[PDB]
Each structure stands twice: as C-alpha cells, then as structure tokens.
Amino acid sequence: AKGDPHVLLTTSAGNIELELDKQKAPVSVQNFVDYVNSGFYNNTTFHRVIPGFMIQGGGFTEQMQQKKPNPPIKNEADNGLRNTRGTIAMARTADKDSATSQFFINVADNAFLDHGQRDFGYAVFGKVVKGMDVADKISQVPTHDVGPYQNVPSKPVVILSATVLP
C-alpha cells in the first residue's frame, strides 16, 4: 500500500506508477526494488492478461523466454494487506514461499486471493498510484496460447523500462 519507494513502469501501452509498502512488506519490497535497480524487468512482458481479473508480468521476454531470477522469498501475505483493485502482489507456485520476480496487478477486487483460513494467499506489497487506466487497457488486449501458457498478448506488452523515482 502506502509505504515509501515509488517505481515507474514504462510500457509499450503507457505508464504505471507504483507506491510500495515498505512497512508492511519489507522482504517483498526489497526483492522488487533489487530487480528494478538491476535492470531485470527491462524488456520483460505482461505475459498473462485476464479482463476482470489481473495482469501478470516480470518473468518472460517477448519471445516468451524465461529470465533466470534470484532465489525465492518468504510469503508476506499475512501482513493484512488485501488484493483489491489497484494493488500489486507477488505471483508464485504451489508452495507459499516460492515467489521470485513475477508480480500481478489486480484490476478487480480479488478477495479469493487473500490470506485466509483456506489458503495462505498472495502477498500484496504496494498499490498503483497512477495509470490504472493503462492497467485496464492492458488487460483487454487480444491474446492467444503460446506453449503451455494461455492469455498471452498477441502483440507483446513490453516493460521498456522500470525505474525507482527520486
């Protein structure tokens, strides 16, 4: 949510500004900023976009090659932050402590993703402060299947740069 560092994602579809919650999600925020500061997210894509749900990125190139990330981090989904529209959270696999570089932006209120009695859920670590219209736009682009992935934009939506703002 409202934490401290701001990050600008400049995409081929427009700009999205993030505010990261360093107080509630210290490990997730540090992890994310290290990826941005190292240039990791430059030329990755939003490889999975689902209208009325979310858009996910930070892992693959245009050619759907997967970049090699750093080691996985502990899940901070029990920090009280919820997966409401306009928040950013960490994607992961089956194990709760499996998140690496991939993140998603909620374009709707997705409470079934929240930490709860049935599942540990997905860690929220910031919010979109500018450019939700862009996030909406990206979620609505034509998609198709590539390899084992569905909902891949037919025309790649590229993160051309990601930078921590002063």
Curated annotation (Swiss-Prot):
Name the record gives this protein = Peptidyl-prolyl cis-trans isomerase A
Instruction: List cystine links.
Output: none
List keywords of the entry alphabetically: Isomerase, Periplasm, Rotamase, Signal
Q: Which PANTHER family match?
A: PEPTIDYL-PROLYL CIS-TRANS ISOMERASE CYP38, CHLOROPLASTIC
- Gene Ontology cellular component list: periplasmic space
Q: A Pfam family matched by this chain, by name?
A: Pro_isomerase
**Which segments constitute the PPIase cyclophilin-type domain?**
3-164
Q: Which NCBIfam families match?
A: PRK10903.1
**Per its UniProt record, what Gene3D superfamilies does this chain match?**
Cyclophilin-like
Question: Does Isomerase show up as a keyword for this record?
Answer: yes
Q: What does this protein do?
A: PPIases accelerate the folding of proteins. It catalyzes the cis-trans isomerization of proline imidic peptide bonds in oligopeptides.
The molecular function terms in GO held by this entry are: peptidyl-prolyl cis-trans isomerase activity
